[PDB]
Amino acid sequence: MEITNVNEYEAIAKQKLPKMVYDYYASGAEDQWTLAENRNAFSRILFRPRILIDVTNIDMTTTILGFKISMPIMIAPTAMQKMAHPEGEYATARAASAAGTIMTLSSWATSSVEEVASTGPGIRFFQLYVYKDRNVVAQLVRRAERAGFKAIALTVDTPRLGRREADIKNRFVLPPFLTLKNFEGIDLGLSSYVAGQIDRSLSWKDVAWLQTITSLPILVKGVITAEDARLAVQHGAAGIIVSNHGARQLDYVPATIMALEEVVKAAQGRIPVFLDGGVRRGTDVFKALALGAAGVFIGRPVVFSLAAEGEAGVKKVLQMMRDEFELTMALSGCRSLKEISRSHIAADWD
Amino acid sequence: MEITNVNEYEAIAKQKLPKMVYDYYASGAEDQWTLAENRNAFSRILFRPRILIDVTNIDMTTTILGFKISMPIMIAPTAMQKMAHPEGEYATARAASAAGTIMTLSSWATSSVEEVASTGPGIRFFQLYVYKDRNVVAQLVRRAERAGFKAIALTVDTPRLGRREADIKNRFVLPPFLTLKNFEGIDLGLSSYVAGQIDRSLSWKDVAWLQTITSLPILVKGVITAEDARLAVQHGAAGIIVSNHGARQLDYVPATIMALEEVVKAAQGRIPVFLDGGVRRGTDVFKALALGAAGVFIGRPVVFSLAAEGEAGVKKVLQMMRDEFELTMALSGCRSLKEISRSHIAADWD
Amino acid sequence: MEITNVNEYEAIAKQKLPKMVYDYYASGAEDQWTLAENRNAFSRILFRPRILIDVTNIDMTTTILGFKISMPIMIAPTAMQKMAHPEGEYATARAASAAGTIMTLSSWATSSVEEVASTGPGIRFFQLYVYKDRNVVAQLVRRAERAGFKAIALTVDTPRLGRREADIKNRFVLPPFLTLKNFEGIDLGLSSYVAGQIDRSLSWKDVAWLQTITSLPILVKGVITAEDARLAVQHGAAGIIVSNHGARQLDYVPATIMALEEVVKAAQGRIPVFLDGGVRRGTDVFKALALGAAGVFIGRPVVFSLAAEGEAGVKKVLQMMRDEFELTMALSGCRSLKEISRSHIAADWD
Amino acid sequence: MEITNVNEYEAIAKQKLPKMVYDYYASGAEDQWTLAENRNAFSRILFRPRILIDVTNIDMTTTILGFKISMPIMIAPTAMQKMAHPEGEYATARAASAAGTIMTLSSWATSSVEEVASTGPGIRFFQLYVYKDRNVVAQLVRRAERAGFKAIALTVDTPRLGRREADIKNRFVLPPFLTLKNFEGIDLGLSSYVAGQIDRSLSWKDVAWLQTITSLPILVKGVITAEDARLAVQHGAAGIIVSNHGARQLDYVPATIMALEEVVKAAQGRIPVFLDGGVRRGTDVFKALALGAAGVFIGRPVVFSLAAEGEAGVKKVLQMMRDEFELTMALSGCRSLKEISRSHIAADWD
Ligand SMILES: Cc1cc2nc3c(=O)[nH]c(=O)nc-3n(C[C@@H](O)[C@H](O)[C@@H](O)COP(=O)(O)O)c2cc1C
Ligand SMILES: Cc1cc2nc3c(=O)[nH]c(=O)nc-3n(C[C@@H](O)[C@H](O)[C@@H](O)COP(=O)(O)O)c2cc1C
Ligand SMILES: Cc1cc2nc3c(=O)[nH]c(=O)nc-3n(C[C@@H](O)[C@H](O)[C@@H](O)COP(=O)(O)O)c2cc1C
Ligand SMILES: Cc1cc2nc3c(=O)[nH]c(=O)nc-3n(C[C@@H](O)[C@H](O)[C@@H](O)COP(=O)(O)O)c2cc1C
C-alpha cells in the first residue's frame, strides 16, 4: 500500500476532515455537472506518441513572465488553507519554493502576504478581486509588492457567488481561530464584510484602473470564450487563465480543457494562456500544453494533500505530477516543452 | 439540512403521498424514455458566459400577451391538486399571484374557476379540451371569462390518453371527497364521463370554432413539429406551447428543449413560443429563453412542493427558481431578458 | 398489479421454467451484444407526431401476399414450443387465428403441420431449411401444402449454429416426451440427425431448386445487407425478412431496425420487406413500418407468454401489441397504415 | 458448467494466483483507460455477413514471413511465465507447436531459448530490447539463431517503464526460485540490472545496427502512428506490429483496433502489419484481418489459462479461438483469409 496518484489524497482528506470543511473544498456548483466534466473531458483526448527518439534527458523548465521555473505546474489560489492543516499557506509556500515553482496566494488566505514571504524566497503571484472599497484594493496591492509578489491575478468570474448547495445545507462558517490575515492590518466579522465587499459593477474599465495603481503584470482568471479573450488582450492583460473556477460558479460551462483551444486561438500568441480545473495527472498536463497552454495550475489537490500530510503531502503531490509529466514526455518522444505539439495529441472533436 | 433545489421536493412528496397519488403525478408514458430525456437533454447544452459586465441590477420582468409579470416562469395546468394537499389549487393560486406570475388552471381541477378567482387578483389562464358536448365547452369558456381569466390554453396532444402503466397496475381512482368542480354547476361519476367526453375527431376547424365563441387569445399546447407550428400560426393561434405533456402521452417524442428551436423558427416571430417539461433549474430557464422561448411553464414541481409544504412549498419553488435564474443571468452577463442570446449558449447539436 | 407490457412475461417465464429451457429461449450468441442492441436500437428513433387530426377510426388491416390480416404483427417461427407449455404450438396456433393474423411454423416444432392445421382455419407459413437429404425437404414441402400452408419461409442465416454459451454450459437436451413431429412420419435421436442434416453448401442455385418443387411464395429469412437483398430479388424471392435470428447466430451484426432501411432501398419496392428481432412495443411496430417494413414478426414474446399463461398469454401478448400500435398511430395522426411515413419518424442517424 | 470463452480464464487465474502475480499480469497503466478501451473498441465494429455461400470448407492457413501456419492467431511475448505455472514457457511452447502456430519468446522468460527449443520443433520468434550493453544484445541474438528462432521482434515502446500502480502498491518482486534464464550464461539480481540496462537513447540508427549483427527479419513492435509506420518501412523493417503494449505503457493511447487502419495504409502493402491487445474472440480476429492485419497476437490469455490449467489451458485457449474464428468466417461467407474484406465489416467511424 502506498499513495501512487494525486486523486487518492481526496479520499484521505475526506476521511479525516469535518464534513463542512471537506464539502467546502470538494463541492461544485449546484448539480455539479461541470465538476465531473472537468475530469472526464481529459478522457476524450488521446495520444499519438513518437517512438525511437533519444529521450535520455527531458527538459521541463519553462519561462513564465520572465521567471524561469522547474516545471509548467503551478499552484492555484485556494482559500482558508489553515482549515486543512494548522500550517496551511505556510506548508504550501515552502513546498512550492522547494518544488521550484510558482504559488498564487489568495486574498482570503488564513496567512498574510508577508507571513508567506518569510517562509523563504520564491516566485509568487497574488490573487485579488476589485472590491467596492477601491482603497482596500490599493492597500492589498501595495502590501503584495512589498512582500515581493511578482504578479496580480485578477479573478473575473465571481461577480456573485455560485450556489454550492452542500455549504448551504451545512451552514458553512469559518472556524473560531482562523482569520483572513491580509485584511487584518490595513484600513477597512471578516468573513461577512469581505463577502459583502464584492463589487458586481466591474467592467473592462476597472481593469484599466488596476493598471494605474500597480505596474505588476495583470493575469485575468476566469476567461472561457474567444470574445472575452480578445478583450483581455486589448485591455493590456499580461496573460489569460482559462478557468471555470473549479466548477464552483456557473454550472454547465464547458470543461476548461475543451474551451482552451478557442481561447488560445483568440489570443493569437500575443500573451500566454494558462489553464486550471481538473488537472490531476501528468497526462493531463501534456494535453493542456499540446493544446496551446503555457502552463497549468492546480487547486483542490493542494488542500487535500495538505489535510492528509501537511507540507509532505503537498511536496508529494508536486513530485508525483512532475514525474508523471516527465514519463509522458518521454513516452511521447518530447525532450523539451518546445517539442510538444498539437500532432502529438488527438481530440474527440477533431 | 435544508431544501436547496426544486427536485428535492419529489423525494418528500414520494415519502408522504400514497403510492397511487405519487405514481399518478410522477409517471411518464410506458417505458418512460422521454420522461428521463426531458431532464437529461438540458445537460447537453452549455454556457458561453460573458465576464466583466455590470450586473448590478438584473431585470427578469417580461410582457406575456400584454400582461407584465415578475419573471418568465409560469405555472402549467396540472390536475386534481387537492390530492396533494387539502388546499390544492387555492395554495397554488395564492402562491402564483404573490410570486407575481401567471397560473394556468386545469379544467379537471378540484376547485372551480370562481373558487380560484376569490383567492385574490392575479393573471390566470384556463386550460381546456374541446369535448364532444360543445355546449359544455361553451359553458366552461363563459364561466372562465366571468372569473376574469385572461386566456384559453387549448391542449391538442391528448386525442386519446397515453398508457401510464403505474396507474393501470395501481387501478387509479379519484379519492372520495374530491370533485372536478368546474363540471359541477353547469349542464352536462365526474371522472368517468369527462374522460369519456374526449372528442378524438378534433382538427384545425375546431380551433376556428373555439375562436367564434370566445375573444380570448387561444394558446395551442402540445405542438412539437415545425409543420404544426405553421398551421397553428395560420389558424389564428395567439401563441404556441412546445410541450410533450410531461412525457405522459406518446413515448419517444423528443425532449421539449430539443424540439423548441424547430418550432421557434417555424413561428417566424409572428407569435410567442413557450415551453414546458423538465424545467427544474434557473439554468434550464436561461437555456429555453436563449433558444427562443418567451417563457416557460412548470408542472410536477408544483404538486410535489404542494404535498410537502402546501402553499409555502409552492412559494419556495417559485423563489428558488427565480433566484437561480437571476444568478444565471448575472454570471452570463445579461442584465435583462432582451440581453439573452443564442450566442450565450452552445448546444451539443451545434 | 397486472401485466401491462409484453416484456414482463420474460420475468414470469424465467421464474417458472427450468434454467435450461429459459436459457435456451432467452440467450443470444456469445457475448450477446446484438441481443441487447436489438432492443436498444429502437430507443434511437424518435417520433414527429401530427396533432389535430381526426383519429376516430384507426385501420390496421394490411394485405400480405394477397392475404388480408387484422394487423401488421405476425408470429415468427420459434422451436420446440411444447417445452414452454404442454399445448405449445396448439395454443399459439389458436391464438394467432383468433387474433386474425399469420403464424409461421418451424420445421423443428413439437407438433406437426397437420396437428396445427386441425386447430382451426388460419393463414399460416412454414419455415424450413434445405437439408442434405433434399428428399426430406420435398416431403416437408408437400406435407405443408396439404395442410394448407400459404408460403415457405426459407431461413438462410444458419449454415452453422451460433455459439449460445449458456446452452453449452447447461448441456441442453430435448426433454423425454417431446418430438420433432414434422420429421415423424416421412422417410428419413431426431435432435441429433436433423441437427446433423444441416447443409452448409447452400447457395443461390438451391433457392432456384426449391422453386422447382413448390409453387408457394418463398420468403428469404436472414438478409441484412443490400447486396444480398438484390440477389434475393433477382432469384425470385417473394419477400425478404430482415432478421439476425434474434441475435443467436453471429454476434456484432447490427440491430435489425438499423439495417432495415438499407434492405428496403435495395428491394426498390419490387417485393415486401419484413423485420423481426427486438419488437416488444407498438412504438417498435410504428418505427419499423415508418422505415419501410410491410409488417413485423415476434419470437421470444410468444414462448415467454406461453410458459406463463399458455394460450391466454399469447392472446394477451397479441392484444397488448395491437392496442399499443393503435394508440401510437392515433397519437401520430395516422388513420391507416398507408398514412405512416418516414417524416413521422426521426432517426439518430439522420 | 464448462469454459466456453477465453475471458473466463482471467477469473480462475485471479482466484488462484497471489494478488501480486495476478495484478502484475492483469494491470494496465495508471488509470487503465486504454486497458478497458482495448476490449471495448471491438464492440464499435459491426459485421455485414454474406448469406447463401458454400461454406463447407474453411481455410484459415496463412503464410507469415514465408512460414505457413494453421491460423492467423499467434502468441505474444509475455514474461516470467513460470510465475503462472511451474512449466511456464515449456507448456506454452508445446501448446503453440501443437496448435500449428508461432510463439514469440520474451528475453525476460523464466526459461531459455534453448530450453524452449528442446520441447520440440516449431516456428518461433524472439522478442528483445536493445540494451545499453550492445554486447549482451549480440550474444542474445546469436543464441536465438542457434536455437533456430526465425525472427527478431524488436519492442520500441518501452524507453522507460509505464506506471502500473498496482505493482507499486504491491511492491512486486520476482519469486525466489525463478530466473531470467536467457541472461544466465553469457557475459554480462537479474531483475534489477536487466531493468537498469534499458537504453533510452535508442533511435532509428540503432535499428540499422541490429540489422548489421543479424540477418533475421526484424519486426518492430509498438508502432501506432502512420508517421512511425513509414519510418519503420524506410529502415528495413520486415513487418510492423501495431501494439500499445497491452495498455501498460502510456495511458490514453488509442485501442490498437482503432489505430490499425492508419498503420496499414501507411505501410502501403510493402510489409505485413500485425496487431495485438484486447484480442479475446474469433470475432475480434475477423475484424482485425478485415481491417488489413496479416495476423494477430495474444498475451494475457496465455498466462491466465496457464495458471488455471497449465498446457491444457493454453491448448484450450488456442482451440476456442480458432473455432470461434472459423465459425465467424463461415457465417460471414468467407472460405479463406483472402476472402475477408473491408466490406464485410462496418466501423463506427465509417
Ligand atoms: C476550496 C477552493 C477555494 C478556492 N478559492 C479560490 C480563491 O481564493 N480565488 C480564486 O480566484 N479561485 C479560487 N478557487 C478556484 C481556483 O483556485 C482554481 O480555479 C482551482 O480550484 C482549479 O481547479 P481544481 O481544483 O480542479 O484544480 C477555489 C477553489 C477551491 C476548491
Ligand atoms: C399530474 C399531472 C397532471 C397534468 N394535468 C394536465 C392537465 O390538466 N392539462 C394539460 O394540458 N396538461 C397536463 N399535464 C401536463 C402539463 O401540465 C405540463 O405539460 C407539465 O406537466 C410540464 O412538465 P413538467 O411536469 O416536467 O414540468 C399534467 C402533468 C402532470 C404531471
Ligand atoms: C427459442 C427460439 C427458437 C428459434 N427458432 C427458430 C426457428 O425454428 N426457425 C427460424 O428460422 N428462426 C428461429 N428463431 C429466431 C426467429 O424465429 C426470429 O428471428 C425471432 O426470434 C425474432 O426475434 P425476437 O425473439 O427478438 O422477437 C428462434 C428464436 C428463438 C428465441
Ligand atoms: C504480463 C505481461 C508481460 C508482458 N511482457 C512483454 C514482454 O516481455 N515483451 C514485450 O514486448 N511485450 C510484453 N507485454 C505485452 C505484449 O506481449 C503484448 O503486446 C500483449 O500483452 C497483447 O495484449 P493482450 O494482453 O491484450 O493480449 C506483456 C504483457 C503482459 C500482460
Ligand SMILES: CCCCCC(CCCCC)Sc1[nH]nnc1C(=O)O
Ligand atoms: C470576494 C469573493 C468572495 C469569495 C471568497 C470565498 C467564497 C465564499 C466563502 C465561504 C462561504 S473563498 C473563494 N475565493 N474565491 N473563490 C472562492 C471559492 O470558495 O470558490
Ligand SMILES: CCCCCC(CCCCC)Sc1[nH]nnc1C(=O)O
Ligand atoms: C379530457 C382529457 C382527460 C385527461 C384528464 C386526466 C387524465 C386521466 C385521469 C386519471 C385516470 S388528468 C390530466 N389532464 N390532462 N392531462 C392529464 C394527465 O394526468 O396527464
Ligand SMILES: CCCCCC(CCCCC)Sc1[nH]nnc1C(=O)O
Ligand atoms: C437445421 C438447423 C438447426 C437449428 C434448430 C434448433 C437449434 C439447436 C437446437 C438445440 C441445441 S432450434 C432453431 N431453429 N432455428 N433456429 C433455432 C434456434 O434455437 O435459434
Ligand SMILES: CCCCCC(CCCCC)Sc1[nH]nnc1C(=O)O
Ligand atoms: C528492458 C525492459 C524491462 C521490461 C521487462 C519487465 C517489466 C518490469 C518487471 C517487473 C517490475 S516484464 C515485460 N517485458 N516487456 N514488457 C513487460 C511488461 O511487464 O509489461
